Design a protein around this ligand. Structure first.
Ligand SMILES: *[C@@H]1O[C@H](CO)[C@@H](O[C@@H]2O[C@H](CO)[C@@H](O[C@@H]3O[C@H](CO)[C@@H](O)[C@H](O)[C@@H]3O)[C@H](O)[C@H]2NC(C)=O)[C@H](O)[C@H]1NC(C)=O
Ligand SMILES: *[C@@H]1O[C@H](CO)[C@@H](O[C@@H]2O[C@H](CO)[C@@H](O[C@@H]3O[C@H](CO)[C@@H](O)[C@H](O)[C@@H]3O)[C@H](O)[C@H]2NC(C)=O)[C@H](O)[C@H]1NC(C)=O
Ligand SMILES: *[C@@H]1O[C@H](CO)[C@@H](O[C@@H]2O[C@H](CO)[C@@H](O)[C@H](O)[C@H]2NC(C)=O)[C@H](O)[C@H]1NC(C)=O
Ligand SMILES: *[C@@H]1O[C@H](CO)[C@@H](O[C@@H]2O[C@H](CO)[C@@H](O)[C@H](O)[C@H]2NC(C)=O)[C@H](O)[C@H]1NC(C)=O
Ligand SMILES: *[C@@H]1O[C@H](CO)[C@@H](O[C@@H]2O[C@H](CO)[C@@H](O)[C@H](O)[C@H]2NC(C)=O)[C@H](O)[C@H]1NC(C)=O
Ligand SMILES: *[C@@H]1O[C@H](CO)[C@@H](O[C@@H]2O[C@H](CO)[C@@H](O)[C@H](O)[C@H]2NC(C)=O)[C@H](O)[C@H]1NC(C)=O
Ligand SMILES: *[C@@H]1O[C@H](CO)[C@@H](O[C@@H]2O[C@H](CO)[C@@H](O)[C@H](O)[C@H]2NC(C)=O)[C@H](O)[C@H]1NC(C)=O
Ligand SMILES: *[C@@H]1O[C@H](CO)[C@@H](O[C@@H]2O[C@H](CO)[C@@H](O)[C@H](O)[C@H]2NC(C)=O)[C@H](O)[C@H]1NC(C)=O
Ligand SMILES: *[C@@H]1O[C@H](CO)[C@@H](O[C@@H]2O[C@H](CO)[C@@H](O)[C@H](O)[C@H]2NC(C)=O)[C@H](O)[C@H]1NC(C)=O
Ligand SMILES: *[C@@H]1O[C@H](CO)[C@@H](O[C@@H]2O[C@H](CO)[C@@H](O)[C@H](O)[C@H]2NC(C)=O)[C@H](O)[C@H]1NC(C)=O
Ligand SMILES: *[C@@H]1O[C@H](CO)[C@@H](O[C@@H]2O[C@H](CO)[C@@H](O)[C@H](O)[C@H]2NC(C)=O)[C@H](O)[C@H]1NC(C)=O
Ligand SMILES: *[C@@H]1O[C@H](CO)[C@@H](O[C@@H]2O[C@H](CO)[C@@H](O)[C@H](O)[C@H]2NC(C)=O)[C@H](O)[C@H]1NC(C)=O
Ligand SMILES: *[C@@H]1O[C@H](CO)[C@@H](O)[C@H](O)[C@H]1NC(C)=O
Ligand SMILES: *[C@@H]1O[C@H](CO)[C@@H](O)[C@H](O)[C@H]1NC(C)=O
Ligand SMILES: *[C@@H]1O[C@H](CO)[C@@H](O)[C@H](O)[C@H]1NC(C)=O
Ligand SMILES: *[C@@H]1O[C@H](CO)[C@@H](O)[C@H](O)[C@H]1NC(C)=O
Ligand SMILES: *[C@@H]1O[C@H](CO)[C@@H](O)[C@H](O)[C@H]1NC(C)=O
Ligand SMILES: *[C@@H]1O[C@H](CO)[C@@H](O)[C@H](O)[C@H]1NC(C)=O
Ligand SMILES: *[C@@H]1O[C@H](CO)[C@@H](O)[C@H](O)[C@H]1NC(C)=O
Ligand SMILES: *[C@@H]1O[C@H](CO)[C@@H](O)[C@H](O)[C@H]1NC(C)=O
Ligand SMILES: *[C@@H]1O[C@H](CO)[C@@H](O)[C@H](O)[C@H]1NC(C)=O
Ligand SMILES: *[C@@H]1O[C@H](CO)[C@@H](O)[C@H](O)[C@H]1NC(C)=O
Ligand SMILES: *[C@@H]1O[C@H](CO)[C@@H](O)[C@H](O)[C@H]1NC(C)=O
Ligand SMILES: *[C@@H]1O[C@H](CO)[C@@H](O)[C@H](O)[C@H]1NC(C)=O
Ligand SMILES: *[C@@H]1O[C@H](CO)[C@@H](O)[C@H](O)[C@H]1NC(C)=O
Ligand SMILES: *[C@@H]1O[C@H](CO)[C@@H](O)[C@H](O)[C@H]1NC(C)=O
Ligand SMILES: *[C@@H]1O[C@H](CO)[C@@H](O)[C@H](O)[C@H]1NC(C)=O
Ligand SMILES: *[C@@H]1O[C@H](CO)[C@@H](O)[C@H](O)[C@H]1NC(C)=O
Ligand SMILES: *[C@@H]1O[C@H](CO)[C@@H](O)[C@H](O)[C@H]1NC(C)=O
Ligand SMILES: *[C@@H]1O[C@H](CO)[C@@H](O)[C@H](O)[C@H]1NC(C)=O
Ligand SMILES: *[C@@H]1O[C@H](CO)[C@@H](O)[C@H](O)[C@H]1NC(C)=O
Ligand SMILES: *[C@@H]1O[C@H](CO)[C@@H](O)[C@H](O)[C@H]1NC(C)=O
Lengths: 103, 441, 126, 126, 441, 126
């Protein structure tokens, strides 16, 4: 199953609310786990089941499901959130991911 | 005007989890003698107008029965001899008399010092161990493969590993719902629900790739999987017709009893009378081809008509998963099923599967304890039915329609769930309240 | 006659006509795995029956399969017509759509039975 | 007073006069052999008592040592004269000669109780 | 017109089988402390007008309590030291210092290498073993007799084998029927039956030929045997009077503790202080002759007045049967008893029975496990009551009236059936239906 | 509402007003120490409930929280005035000062119920 992400990159200032989309080609239920990778650091779990927060993740992260349209919403952006965001469905990873950097 | 009236014994049930006791119709590893004697005539009641949701995966019965089988397996070895003295340096020489081309090095003639009845006295004896049980130490010096990871207790030779059908009966106040739909894929509503006091004959067969002696589908070969899209959940296949499989151990094995202590006997493997050949399982080529044709015809539906379906052998892993392992008359086989899953499909003869024997068996992958299956005297041979498949799909490149399916298994819950698939456990709730024109006095 | 849960899909009246067959099936070695499982199942069954019988007894309806009482229908639990309920509905959907309000109904039954029994005592003594 | 099973050999009427003394004796640690046997015996006793109590409850006779019903006695079961039965017979022979017809009698009891209770509800509602 | 009237609590019972719990009035082998404390005043009720069928031979209670005894015997052995290191080569010499003529060669002074607290360190120690416990290997080399066919576990020295009376009590809803008839011939109807909450004091005495500490017949010696014409069924003899038997072991033995490992102690037999004599039992000649006269008088009834009754000793077999074996203060005896069944009959003095003692005891003949009875310090003396015999008749030619009876036993169920002979287990059914002129309102 | 044993220290009438809340709490894995303790506790609770239910049933008072009988008060057990008992005393003291006369009262209740039922039999028959 092909999985797509958009936008490829985005810049937001401190404290803004931003969202990232992850579109799936077929019905995947809610199995769209999210992962964030800080530059030069191994990726770690953000959201599992597409709406459940991983342990240690602040409540400021939120995920939701609109049919086959999936969103990860970020509130009150903070500097440590800079990096890349990946959404996983089964064995498929979105090509390129989404890069988030400070404005 | 209106008032409420309390009812007793209303036909109302809720999904619930409870303990199920066994009933069954020589000692056995599964304590069938401990099962209550089932009624000669089971009672089955058809529930017309009823539509109940079913789900093998979220069913408790599979987990409960996995626990039950593991408990029985553990209990059957407690009053059995512990082979701790066998962990001694071995002197093994290859057996090379009257052996065939494929028997070069599969059996080892190991001689070792062993404790006799008298503690101070010792004794030198010899035994025949298959190559998979002994590992070289770096004639040469060998040891049992268990010796650095676990301690084995010899399976008591008098208990039979043969599967006896056992029925799991819910206590009073609970009911078992049996889905009568012949096209029921295992998830979603089952329009035809019939209740029974408890299950039909369930044989807890122990197999990995091919499901032996199982229950057949009534109409067509069916494909059952939690999320077919997810290329990880095993695809449970159930055959509408049986595929007979024959296989035997041609060696005329002899059981030699070696006393290793007070009342403790270790049953070794003596010299084989006659030539030594390969254990090999036979499957009819035409019957297997027809069954594969039916399977691929029913599989195309879930995917597409124009897609290419190709069966390849197991990718890799431990011996149990890579091969087709199953106990046959007290012996544990490991059959190299590469000639079965080999064809590629586009929109009298028998297949010989070379099997390998193992005596040090570690089922359930328990940390610290393993089993030594005593050798079976004579030539063992069993005729079983291939009644299912456990296929694992491989993720494609999203560019080709060549869906590749390989045998899986290992997780015995998958093997067992093809038998408890049509059943469900419900809790009777006989108190009901409804409005009626009645009034208390 | 149909048997245990025979009229599960039948209408309300037909199901109530044969309450006994479900009522009579609510109640009917070493320390081996199957032995302990059997004992635990037996105890679970007997306790479930005793709990059900106790709940019946509190409302002053012990020994009666169909018993009525003296608490009104609040009509917020369900406002469906009687004919539709008892002719075109099964017990399954009824319990499905009334499950949340069970506790307050049980409490009303309890209070009504207690008050009626006290009134019976008072009128009996006088 | 004679005690538990004191009137076992008595006549029908004398035995029925003292049903209570036999009626009161149907109901009254580690995993050791004695302990497990004690537990099994306890559970067996409680289950047997509740089976009997439930069987009485179905016929609408719970709480009554002697309870009457509304099913006729077909003479095929026993055509003996009442005076002979209640003055020159013990309960042992009586159970001996009706061991086979017990189940159909129980079924008639259950059906009669259900129908009578439904009629009572109909009269109470009207 | 008539109607049915249900009745609760009717006095109706049926023959049935059920589990019976223990009740009884230092730790002991039978765990009588685990038995519930019995009522100080048993409730015994007389059921006249009642005639109930009885049959000891098909009674469940004997089988159930035999199973109970075996389970208790096994369980009392689990938390005890396992004597696996003792199965080591022995160097035994004759004990010929201060011994009598009959004691020549019965003791063996065995010295052996034994492991000590420190595993690497070994140890040499000596102990005394009776000739029946050690077998020669072909001073000489010996080994414990059951070190090539069973594992030896020492009985814990602080638990006593003395029989504490136990009462078998049925659960609620069940009753125990006691046949008060003093002439109950062992089967058929019992005219005088009476119910009790549960049994009197039953001592599970262990014996083979003569019944010790049993219950006496009230009026006269009774002969009870299913199919007495069958010359293979044991004949249960019960005495109306007790025959006093005095059994003693004159040796003043010393218990020497030998530590064979961490917290594990093997209690050996040290040197005997003073002269070594033969353990023996004493039976009054006149009393035994009178009892035999009563038995033969009561035995002529089943065979005729003119027949000749002759008592010979037990024929060949294992030691436990050929001899009168029992336990006496923690020690197991094996008594000759050829002077008892010695005479023939035609229409102050004591009989000394030379007994032999054994330490390796295998009761119940379990395969793989044996018991080592620890020696008892001091001189042991027992005063028991001979209350029964196990006589096995022998067939003969049609021209002979000389019926020969020999002591039997072995099957402990025969030992115990003489105590549960007058009891029976019944199931109370309190529901009854009767025709009355009453019709429900 | 106060809860389980809420009116333990209350007067007789207030305690009698709320019998139901103590009435309901009279009834509500491997061979591990905790498991066996749980199982024994469960069985003990079941039997403790059933003994009380049987005692109520023998007196012809099953299913009734308050039941009147035909046993006269001997006045030797307690001669206290009704107003004093039912307005200035707690159930605990009442049970304290009749701990010895309980058995004879139970026997009188049993015999009175038995005779009463058989009397009913005669009238229902005639
Ligand atoms: C699937 O079911 C078939 C049919 O029950 C099983 O075949 C049976 O396998 C047992 C295994 O020992 C055979 O028992 C042997 O029978 C011979 C007959 O003389 C006897 O001498 C041996 O001592 C042993 O008892 C049995 O004959 C064979 N066939 C039948 C009809 O029972 C098969 O084993 C089952 N599949 C698996 C994987 O176990
Ligand atoms: C038959 O019953 C008699 C009496 O019930 C048994 O005799 C008793 O045997 C025990 C030991 O076998 C004696 O207890 C021991 O006594 C000595 C000396 O007092 C003491 O040092 C020990 O620690 C132990 O307590 C008991 O005194 C004796 N009773 C007598 C002699 O009156 C007899 O053993 C039974 N027969 C059997 C079991 O075969
Ligand atoms: C194994 O398969 C054979 C058939 O190859 C089964 O034998 C009979 O098969 C026919 C065909 O449907 C059935 O109608 C019979 O009922 C089968 N015999 C019996 C005794 O059931 C055989 O039963 C199968 N063994 C299994 C499933 O264990
Ligand atoms: C794939 O698997 C997921 C596993 O959860 C399925 O998702 C659930 O589907 C059920 C269907 O009744 C819903 O009730 C759940 O709420 C879903 N939850 C989650 C976590 O997704 C999904 O339906 C499956 N779908 C496919 C395409 O196989
Ligand atoms: C499995 O099938 C093979 C052949 O497909 C069998 O092997 C032959 O067995 C016969 C005796 O039955 C021999 O004469 C032949 O030499 C064997 N080899 C060949 C190539 O034919 C084998 O016996 C079968 N095993 C079974 C039925 O258990
Ligand atoms: C497996 O073995 C069975 C016999 O154990 C084979 O059945 C035999 O088949 C031949 C040829 O069709 C018949 O002549 C025999 O009468 C059959 N014997 C029976 C039914 O007992 C079966 O063909 C074998 N299967 C394979 C794949 O080798
Ligand atoms: C699946 O089949 C392939 C080829 O049919 C097997 O690959 C062979 O593996 C052996 C090792 O045992 C090599 O010696 C061969 O050279 C391989 N052949 C190839 C790569 O063409 C593979 O082992 C099989 N896997 C199984 C049976 O689990
Ligand atoms: C299982 O079967 C396959 C196919 O028969 C075996 O693969 C062959 O292995 C031999 C050497 O063992 C090679 O010479 C062949 O080239 C391989 N391929 C074929 C098609 O024969 C495999 O070795 C067997 N055993 C295992 C453990 O996989
Ligand atoms: C059994 O009786 C014998 C005699 O028949 C007793 O043997 C005598 O014992 C006394 C000691 O009390 C010695 O002084 C005698 O010399 C013995 N007489 C012999 C050996 O002929 C024996 O003590 C008795 N055993 C008992 C009572 O346990
Ligand atoms: C068994 O021993 C007891 C006591 O040791 C003997 O009983 C004594 O018998 C003598 C007669 O020889 C009397 O004078 C004593 O008064 C008795 N004492 C007691 C306590 O009973 C008994 O006679 C011995 N029996 C045999 C057969 O040796
Ligand atoms: C029963 O009595 C006979 C004869 O008294 C015993 O036979 C003796 O057996 C021994 C063996 O220990 C021989 O040494 C004797 O020669 C035999 N005497 C004979 C044949 O007259 C027989 O042993 C006695 N039974 C038992 C069990 O001891
Ligand atoms: C049991 O006792 C009898 C008689 O007391 C023993 O038979 C005697 O044994 C001796 C020893 O060899 C012989 O000299 C006698 O001839 C035998 N007969 C008689 C009448 O004394 C018998 O051996 C004993 N059983 C044993 C010791 O096992
Ligand atoms: C194994 O070796 C022993 C000698 O150690 C020999 O007696 C026996 O025949 C051998 N077995 C074979 C070669 O199969
Ligand atoms: C013995 O068998 C081993 C395989 O386990 C093999 O490596 C070795 O070469 C063989 N030695 C012979 C045949 O002499
Ligand atoms: C047994 O022990 C002896 C002692 O040296 C040794 O020579 C022999 O090789 C041993 N046998 C084995 C290890 O099989
Ligand atoms: C046991 O030995 C094998 C080789 O004989 C080795 O591969 C394995 O890692 C060892 N396991 C241990 C040391 O736990
Ligand atoms: C099984 O059938 C139901 C029918 O509603 C369908 O919803 C479900 O997706 C099917 N499952 C599979 C595995 O095809
Ligand atoms: C196996 O060997 C034994 C001899 O030990 C023989 O009696 C039997 O017939 C043999 N079995 C076969 C199938 O050759
Ligand atoms: C199985 O059937 C397919 C059908 O296309 C055929 O190509 C193949 O050769 C067959 N295999 C056999 C008969 O072994
Ligand atoms: C698998 O099939 C290929 C050709 O389709 C064949 O060459 C090969 O031998 C087969 N493998 C077997 C029969 O094990
Ligand atoms: C099922 O529904 C049909 C139509 O509503 C009805 O006629 C039938 O009686 C129902 N089934 C049962 C068992 O009552
Ligand atoms: C026993 O029978 C006699 C005479 O038949 C009778 O008088 C007596 O009352 C009976 N016993 C009982 C307890 O009724
Ligand atoms: C030693 O004792 C044995 C008893 O087993 C006896 O046969 C042997 O003659 C005795 N030897 C001596 C020298 O006393
Ligand atoms: C047994 O032999 C030991 C020496 O090994 C000796 O000290 C002891 O006194 C002997 N016991 C006897 C002869 O009873
Ligand atoms: C103990 O072992 C030593 C070692 O040689 C031996 O000399 C001695 O005889 C042994 N003692 C026994 C067998 O009692
Ligand atoms: C054990 O040794 C005894 C010694 O006589 C012998 O009779 C018996 O057969 C042996 N048991 C075995 C070797 O299993
Ligand atoms: C016991 O007495 C009964 C009385 O009828 C008789 O039938 C039976 O044969 C007797 N059994 C004997 C004498 O063994
Ligand atoms: C043995 O018999 C006597 C009567 O002579 C008796 O006093 C004593 O209690 C009996 N001992 C038992 C039964 O243990
Ligand atoms: C046994 O010996 C001890 C000394 O060890 C002594 O006190 C006791 O009196 C002796 N017993 C007899 C009966 O002589
Ligand atoms: C037993 O007594 C009888 C009669 O008193 C007598 O004839 C017989 O000889 C006596 N026998 C013995 C062994 O005392
Ligand atoms: C058996 O009786 C005979 C005849 O009285 C006698 O000679 C013999 O010694 C007796 N056997 C014994 C006492 O062991
Ligand atoms: C406690 O006693 C006082 C007066 O004695 C009373 O008013 C109060 O109600 C009692 N408590 C309760 C909870 O009833």
């Amino acid at each position: 199953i092909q999985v797509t992400q958009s936008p490829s990159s985005l810049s937001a200032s401190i404290g803004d609310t931003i969202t990232v989309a992850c579109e799936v080609s077929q019905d995947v239920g809610w199995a769209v786990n999210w992962y964030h990778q800080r530059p030069g650091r191994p990726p770690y779990n953000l959201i599992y089941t597409a709406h459940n927060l991983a342990p240690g993740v602040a409540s400021r992260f939120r995920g939701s499901r609109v049919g086959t349209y999936f969103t990860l919403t970020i509130n009150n952006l903070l500097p440590e959130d800079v990096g890349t965001y990946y959404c996983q469905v089964f064995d498929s990873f979105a090509p390129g991911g989404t890069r988030v950097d400070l404005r | 005007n209106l008032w409420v009236t309390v009812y007793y014994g209303v036909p109302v049930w809720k999904d619930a989890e409870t303990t199920l006791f066994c009933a069954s119709d020589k000692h056995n590893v599964w304590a069938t003698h401990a099962c209550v004697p089932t009624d000669p005539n089971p009672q089955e009641i058809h529930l017309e107008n009823v539509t109940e949701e079913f789900n093998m995966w979220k069913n408790n019965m599979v987990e409960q029965m996995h626990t039950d089988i593991i408990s029985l397996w553990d209990q059957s070895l407690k009053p059995c001899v512990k082979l701790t003295p066998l962990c001694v340096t071995l002197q093994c020489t290859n057996v090379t008399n009257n052996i065939t081309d494929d028997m070069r090095g599969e059996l080892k003639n190991c001689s070792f010092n062993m404790t006799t009845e008298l503690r101070d006295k010792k004794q030198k004896v010899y035994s025949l161990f298959y190559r998979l049980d002994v590992v070289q130490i770096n004639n040469k010096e060998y040891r049992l493969i268990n010796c650095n990871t676990s301690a084995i207790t010899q399976a008591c030779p008098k208990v039979s590993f043969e599967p006896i059908p056992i029925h799991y009966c819910a206590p009073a106040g609970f009911a078992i719902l049996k889905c009568k739909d012949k096209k029921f894929n295992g998830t979603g509503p089952c329009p035809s629900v019939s209740t029974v006091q408890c299950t039909h004959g369930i044989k807890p067969v122990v197999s990995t790739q091919l499901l032996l002696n199982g229950s057949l589908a009534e109409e067509e070969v069916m494909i059952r999987s939690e999320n077919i899209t997810n290329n990880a959940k095993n695809i449970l296949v159930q055959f509408n017709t049986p595929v007979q499989i024959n296989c035997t151990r041609p060696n005329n094995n002899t059981r030699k009893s070696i006393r290793i202590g007070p009342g403790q006997a270790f049953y070794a493997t003596g010299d084989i009378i006659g030539d030594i050949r390969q254990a090999h399982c036979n499957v009819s080529k035409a019957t297997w081809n027809e069954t594969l044709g039916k399977v691929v015809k029913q599989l195309r539906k879930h995917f597409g008509n124009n897609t290419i379906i190709r069966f390849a052998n197991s990718s890799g892993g431990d011996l149990e998963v890579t091969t087709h392992s199953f106990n046959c008359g007290g012996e544990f086989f490991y059959c190299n099923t590469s000639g079965l899953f080999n064809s590629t499909w586009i929109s009298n003869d028998s297949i010989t599967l070379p099997c390998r024997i193992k005596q040090i068996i570690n089922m359930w992958q328990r940390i610290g304890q393993a089993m030594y299956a005593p050798p079976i005297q004579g030539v063992i041979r069993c005729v079983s039915n291939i009644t299912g498949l456990i296929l694992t799909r491989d993720g494609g490149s999203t560019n080709s329609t060549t869906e590749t399916f390989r045998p899986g298994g290992g997780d015995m819950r998958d093997n067992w769930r093809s038998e408890l698939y049509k059943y469900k456990v419900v809790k009777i709730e006989p108190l009901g309240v409804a409005p009626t024109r009645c009034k208390r006095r | 006659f149909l048997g245990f849960l025979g009229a599960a899909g039948s209408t309300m009246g037909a199901a109530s006509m044969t309450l006994t067959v479900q009522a009579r099936n609510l109640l009917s070695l070493k320390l081996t795995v199957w032995g302990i499982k059997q004992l635990q199942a037996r105890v679970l069954a007997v306790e479930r029956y005793l709990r059900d019988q106790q709940l019946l007894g509190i409302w002053g309806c012990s020994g009666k399969l169909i018993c009525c009482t003296n608490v009104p229908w609040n009509s917020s639990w369900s406002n469906r017509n009687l004919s539709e309920i008892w002719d075109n509905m099964t017990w399954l959907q009824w319990d499905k759509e009334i499950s949340n309000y069970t506790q307050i109904i049980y409490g009303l039954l309890e209070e009504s039975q207690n008050q009626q029994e006290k009134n019976e005592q008072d009128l009996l003594a006088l």
